[PDB]
Design a protein around this nucleic acid. Structure first.
Ligand SMILES: Nc1ncnc2c1ncn2[C@@H]1O[C@H](COP(=O)(O)OP(=O)(O)OP(=O)(O)O)[C@@H](O)[C@H]1O
Ligand SMILES: [Mg+2]
Lengths: 301, 997
DNA sequence: GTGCATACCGCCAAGAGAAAAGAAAACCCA
RNA sequence: GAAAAG
DNA sequence: TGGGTTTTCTTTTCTCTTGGCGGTATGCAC
């Protein structure tokens, strides 16, 4: 949660946020627009922009001056990380639901496999890229919160630490983990911008970075369903629980099937480590188990 | 302290003593001769252990070799070395001149001949042998004669332990031979170490699949039995090889029990492992504890202690048996000690690392030894062998958790072949005989199994050593009260059992307390599946505990049984059998009744009637005459609820405690239909409870006239409640908040009652956070059906406020005593100490709350589990826990002392007394007498300056610092700053009708 | 006297298992 | 994750 | 002074910390 006052190369990021010049139905769900300088930079594009400010001190001015915009802003008081209630009684101004936000916008996307419905721009706080990064993946496989209706783009600022760890492969083996596997197959994440973190003011450090969180049609499969995902995750965390072991040892810890048979189904042969796994390799390890329909006992989740 | 490997070797030599494996101990002592790195680890205790071992065999050559080993490293021989030498010389029938030379050398070095017979902890066989060895040289030497046992002479315990008094101690309803037979039955149960009970679930009809799965499981279990045996002998030979070269192998620990018993125990823990598997360290701790608890019973079996226990017990039963008379009446501990007391030295627990490696070795060898065919669909099909158990992990935030989960085919085999039986550990079952009297903090409760005097979560514990440092007569009242509580014969109300088994076996009735089976459980899509799994798992756990309790209740249906009682660290008394006891729910309390009955007399029936109203929850705010008039008004409803419980007007289901009200309805229905109601012998306990006994004790300490009016210490015609008044004030603020812009006022309506603010107003004199009040006033609101589920959080925070607003300017002296106790605990914990105090009955109480727990790691094969030392190894007291714990722990010490005084003075009057915490149960004939005794003991407890005695004891204990007193003068003045007592006079409590009601 | 095997301790990354819903304020490390 | 007793 | 952490106490049933690498010290064969 940082209020950014820098206008530095805001036009370039606004144009890469804009995409096609002919179409302004694509909407920008800007998160924490405190000073409103980034709001004016996004208004320079000309497309419709919606703010989801959560702080009560900066919200009364945000409804004001919208008449000069002639209807280019619909201010809604919420925050992007909570949305769907988990242990919740009633509706409070800090947190609302996905149905309420999407009915206020009026935007509903019945098919997931069609074109992208919407775009979200946002940030992660100083502490908590891991928690909300976990949260978005949890929302992304089982369709929950912002990903509940459609395949919404979550193009947003990340720390450089994650962009080393989340884009890690068996190359650079020291920093490599489960969010890496989930996100690198979940979204096609490329290069956008590389501004310094300490350059942006806050109302010696790792440099800020910007990523594209765009989900892929290859995600949900006849074997990897959106409802079986918690079976999938308990592979990945367990396989990286002790990472200096063959995949046969972890399968015998996690599966009653013959692990060497599963490895001769996928191709790797009996010496092969969990650290020397690409993100697609875990998905293939998950889905080679499934089609053996005769063996009903498949997992130990 | 010694090193870890030093503890391993010391436990090794002790276990070779107890397994009678002396060549192995001598060999490993020889191997650590010739090096300095590990002979430095060898201390005088290990040499004394081998010294005593070669002494008990009568070996002299190895004896002299161990002596040369002790003198070779410059170590000085100890008292045990000369005691062992005299033992070996007595056993060998040594020439009297050489024993004379031994005694001259022993007296020459500086030994105390008189202290060796007393200070050295050694068995009576060793004592007899060393006594014979001395008396062959000095025939005129003799031990001092036994003194008469001491008598406690504290002021509160002066009337008890006074021989110049007229006593009538009650006697059991069972004769001497019957109690001897029950003693033999419980002895056989504790030797067997397990109990098999029939499940009270309705039996499934025999089928082809059921018996086929039964035979498959039996064949698999025989294969596993042979596999566990083979693996155990292969490990045994590997560890014996690893003993012949010098290493700690755990070989004598595996030789502590027979192979069949270890394989049987491993098969038992395989059988009792759930579908969701238990934690790996839990299996390790369980296997280590079961091995230790079976080794204890095996050792008393071999050593001849069982026969001595029998010979003492058949003589001890003459005090309690109705037909047998002692010459002088005395307490059970006094008759245990006046009779020739059998020797019972404490057996020390194993070192905690070695406990962990034994548990891990048994767990690993169970994991590796058991193998099942993977494809159970076709028996003729060739299938590879898969492990029965698997090492899964479970991750909770940072935490990595190792779990041994069974094979799903094995689980499906377990529920498909439904097992008609259930197995309990013998200490988890009520005793069939009267328990051993608590004569020490080491002897009591069960016959052969060690039972702790103070309950504790941790294995290593500060409470027991503090119980041993005190004078011997200090704990006499607490021990006699625990013995009196354990000496209450219990039986099962079979009619209530019949009705609960009627509802359990069919579709359950969830409102009465009888759980419903998950066959009746309910069966966006993922939300429905998640809700189904959650509800099904909750119902399954609830029905599992109900099945355990009902199976134990069915087992003890025709038997008179005893519940031995134990303490917590603050002094409250809990019965040791966990499932079926009178501290449980409404169903469990309805099942239990007294086995010995008393005639009602001229005032019995009325009390029963009052008790029935006390179980309805109606007429709670009325005088006793109004309660009795109500009971006479609803007498037909009582008779119909007793005669037709489930087929009639069903009045008893509307009671606050329905099954207890049903049992009391049956008792009243039997009593009023008797020919002479005075001559009706009644076994139903009648309960007297204190209205806010915390506030009662607080107002008794502070002498607050307003508080002693508010909670019934001042005489009055009507009962007084704080909950009703505070709830009325909250309803005033709710009506004030009505017809304004606040939705919660109209949402609440009539849901503000005594129950929703009961816990908070009860708690608040023990310092409660405003955040915890939300959780404290939401479960009561969540269980309401008419309450909307949307505004649970809103109404929770609405009841957090307007209660503390109502409680300001209230309980001034109580809040002052609270503040002084809290600041005393804060300053005691802030100077790096734990808060410690002595009760007025002499019990020492200390608080085990330390942060920054010391942790160690085990290197192993399957995984590495982390074990925590808490036996004073942690050196940082936890200030927040001490602050939040002292103001309730002091009050719990006080009402435990009140209960113990009431018990001890009711015992002298021939009363059967038991107690749930602040709820005193006795026969309906004796209630007034109990009330009378209770009031005096309250007046006797609170005539003593408990605040002032606590202050001067705290000054003596915690203010004696040589240099720290300069910064501790502030806590010195806060301990000397008890607020002054008010103007309430205690003998009025003697005339208080509704003190306990 | 030197190199290798063994055992012990530190120490950060654990993927700070999603609750980043929440009215509430005091305590200990930085 | 739930239930019960004080 | 700014920021991470817990929320009155006890007891019982159901069933919630491990792993990997690297550096340092120590003991033993040639
Ligand atoms: N949650 C609690 N925290 C602290 N002490 C408690 C708690 N619950 C019970 N106690 C202790 O148990 C006793 C109160 O038990 P109980 O449930 O009978 O309440 P009560 O207010 O005495 O009841 P009643 O007014 O209905 O007769 C007191 O000694 C009190 O200190
Ligand atoms: Mg009470």
């Amino acid at each position: 949660k940082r209020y950014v006052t820098d206008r530095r190369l805001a036009e370039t990021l606004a144009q890469i946020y804009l995409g096609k010049p002919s179409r302004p139905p694509h909407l920008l769900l800007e998160c924490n627009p405190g000073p409103g300088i980034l709001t004016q930079a996004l208004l320079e594009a000309g497309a419709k922009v919606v703010a989801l400010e959560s702080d009560k001190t900066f919200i009364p001015h945000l409804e004001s001056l919208g008449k000069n915009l002639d209807g280019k802003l619909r201010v809604i008081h919420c925050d992007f990380f909570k949305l769907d209630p988990r242990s919740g009684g009633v509706i409070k101004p800090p947190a609302m639901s996905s149905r309420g936000l999407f009915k206020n916008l009026g935007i509903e996307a019945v098919p997931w496999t069609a074109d992208i419905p919407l775009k979200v721009v946002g940030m992660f706080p100083s502490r908590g890229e891991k928690r909300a990064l976990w949260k978005l993946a949890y929302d992304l496989y089982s369709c929950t919160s912002i990903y509940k209706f459609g395949r919404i783009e979550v193009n947003m600022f990340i720390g450089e630490k994650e962009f080393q760890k989340l884009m890690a492969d068996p190359g650079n083996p020291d920093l490599y983990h489960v969010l890496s596997v989930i996100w690198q197959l979940a979204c096609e994440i490329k290069v956008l911008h590389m501004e310094p973190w300490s350059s942006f003011d806050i109302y010696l450090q790792q440099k800020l970075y910007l990523i594209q969180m765009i989900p892929r049609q290859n995600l949900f499969t006849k074997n990897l369903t959106p409802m079986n995902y918690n079976i999938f995750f308990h592979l990945l965390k367990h396989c990286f629980g002790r990472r200096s072991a063959t995949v046969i040892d972890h399968l015998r810890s996690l599966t009653p099937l013959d692990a060497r048979d599963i490895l001769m189904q996928i191709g790797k042969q009996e010496d092969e480590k969990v650290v020397n796994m690409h993100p697609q390799d875990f998905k293939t390890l998950f889905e080679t188990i499934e089609r053996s329909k005769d063996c009903a006992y498949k997992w130990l989740y | 302290q010694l090193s870890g490997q030093q503890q391993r070797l010391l436990a090794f030599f002790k276990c070779c003593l107890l397994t009678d494996q002396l060549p192995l101990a001598h060999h490993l002592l020889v191997v650590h001769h010739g090096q300095r790195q590990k002979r430095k680890l060898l201390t005088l205790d290990m040499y004394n252990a081998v010294m005593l071992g070669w002494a008990r065999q009568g070996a002299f050559k190895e004896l002299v070799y161990v002596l040369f080993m002790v003198k070779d490293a410059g170590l000085t021989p100890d008292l045990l070395s000369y005691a062992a030498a005299l033992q070996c010389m007595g056993r060998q029938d040594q020439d009297a001149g050489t024993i004379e030379r031994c005694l001259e050398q022993m007296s020459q070095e500086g030994l105390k001949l008189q202290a060796l017979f007393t200070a050295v902890l050694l068995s009576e066989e060793d004592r007899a042998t060393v006594l014979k060895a001395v008396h062959k040289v000095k025939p005129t030497f003799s031990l001092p004669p036994q003194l008469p046992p001491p008598v406690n002479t504290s002021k509160l315990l002066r009337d008890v332990y006074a021989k110049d008094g007229r006593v009538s101690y009650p006697k059991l309803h069972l004769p001497l031979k019957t109690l001897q037979c029950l003693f033999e039955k419980q002895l056989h149960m504790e030797l067997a170490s397990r109990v098999c009970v029939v499940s009270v679930e309705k039996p499934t009809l025999p089928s082809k699949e059921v018996k086929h799965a039964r035979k498959t499981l039996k064949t698999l279990r025989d294969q596993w039995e042979k596999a566990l045996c083979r693996a155990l002998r292969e490990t045994k030979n590997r560890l014996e090889r690893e003993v012949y070269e010098g290493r700690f192998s755990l070989y004598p620990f595996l030789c502590l029990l027979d192979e069949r018993e270890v394989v049987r125990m491993l098969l038992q823990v395989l059988q009792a492992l759930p579908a969701q598997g238990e934690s790996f360290t839990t299996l390790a701790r369980e296997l280590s504890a079961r091995t230790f608890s079976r080794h204890v019973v095996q050792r008393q079996r071999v050593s001849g202690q069982v026969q001595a226990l029998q010979n003492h017990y058949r003589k001890y039963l003459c005090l309690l048996a109705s037909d047998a008379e002692v010459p002088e009446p005395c307490l059970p501990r006094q008759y245990w000690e006046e009779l020739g007391a059998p020797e019972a030295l404490r057996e020390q627990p194993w070192p905690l690392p070695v406990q962990m490696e034994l548990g891990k070795l048994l767990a690993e060898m169970l994991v590796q030894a058991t193998q099942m065919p993977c494809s159970l669909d076709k028996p003729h099909r060739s299938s590879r062998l898969v492990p029965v158990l698997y090492h899964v992990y479970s991750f909770r935030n940072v935490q990595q958790i190792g779990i041994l989960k069974p094979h799903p085919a094995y689980v499906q085999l377990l529920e498909k072949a439904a097992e008609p039986t259930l197995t309990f550990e013998a200490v988890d079952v009520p005793m069939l005989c009267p328990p051993l009297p608590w004569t020490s903090p080491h002897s009591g409760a069960f016959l052969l199994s060690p039972t702790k005097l103070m309950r504790t979560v941790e294995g290593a514990t500060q409470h027991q050593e503090l119980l041993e440092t005190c004078p011997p007569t200090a704990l006499h009242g607490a021990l006699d009260a625990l013995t009196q509580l354990g000496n209450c014969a219990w039986r099962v109300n079979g009619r209530v059992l019949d009705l609960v088994l009627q509802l359990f076996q069919a579709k359950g009735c969830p409102q009465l307390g009888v759980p419903a089976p998950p066959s009746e459980a309910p069966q966006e899509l993922r939300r429905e599946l998640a809700h189904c799994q959650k509800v099904a798992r909750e119902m399954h756990s609830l029905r599992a505990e109900a099945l355990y309790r009902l199976s134990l209740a069915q087992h003890l249906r025709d038997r008179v049984f005893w519940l031995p009682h134990n303490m917590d660290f603050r002094g409250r008394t809990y019965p040791c059998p966990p499932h079926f006891n009178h501290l449980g729910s409404d169903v469990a309390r309805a099942l239990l009744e007294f086995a010995q009955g008393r005639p009602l007399g001229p005032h019995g029936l009325d009390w029963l009637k009052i008790h029935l109203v006390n179980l309805t929850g109606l007429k709670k705010r009325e005088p006793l005459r109004k309660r009795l008039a109500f009971a006479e008004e609803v007498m037909d409803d009582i008779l119909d609820s007793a005669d037709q419980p489930l087929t009639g007007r069903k009045w008893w289901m509307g009671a606050e405690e329905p099954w207890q009200t049903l049992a009391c309805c049956m008792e009243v229905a039997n009593a009023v239909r008797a020919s002479d109601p005075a001559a009706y012998v009644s076994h139903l306990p009648v309960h007297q409870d204190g209205s806010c006994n915390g506030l009662q004790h607080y107002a008794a300490l502070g002498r607050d006239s307003v508080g002693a009016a508010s909670v019934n210490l001042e005489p009055s015609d009507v009962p007084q409640d704080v909950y009703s008044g505070v709830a009325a004030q909250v309803e005033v603020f709710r009506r004030q908040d009505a017809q304004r812009g606040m939705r919660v006022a109209q949402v609440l309506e009539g849901f503000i009652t005594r129950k929703v603010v009961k816990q908070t107003v009860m708690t608040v004199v023990y310092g409660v956070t405003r955040y915890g009040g939300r959780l404290q006033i939401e479960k009561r609101l969540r269980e309401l059906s008419d309450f909307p589920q949307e505004f649970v959080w809103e109404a929770s925070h609405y009841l957090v406020r307007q209660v503390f607003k109502s409680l300001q300017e209230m309980f001034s002296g109580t809040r002052a005593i609270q503040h002084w106790l809290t600041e005393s605990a804060r300053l005691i914990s802030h100077m790096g100490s734990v808060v410690e105090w002595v009760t007025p009955l002499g019990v020492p109480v200390i608080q085990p709350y330390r942060l920054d727990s010391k942790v160690k790691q085990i290197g192993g094969g399957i995984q590495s589990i982390t074990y925590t030392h808490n036996g004073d190894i942690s050196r940082k007291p936890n200030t927040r826990k001490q602050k939040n714990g002292f103001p309730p722990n002091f009050i719990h010490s006080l009402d435990s002392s009140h209960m113990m005084l009431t018990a001890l003075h009711c015992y002298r009057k021939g009363l059967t007394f038991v107690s749930v915490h602040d709820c005193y149960w006795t026969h309906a004939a004796d209630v007034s007498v109990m009330n009378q005794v209770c009031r005096e003991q309250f007046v006797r407890l609170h005539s003593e300056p408990i605040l002032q005695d606590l202050s001067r004891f705290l000054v003596k204990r915690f203010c004696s610092e040589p240099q720290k007193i300069l910064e501790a003068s502030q806590l010195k003045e806060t301990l000397q700053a008890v607020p002054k007592p008010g103007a309430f006079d205690l003998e009025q409590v003697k005339r208080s009708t509704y003190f306990f009601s």
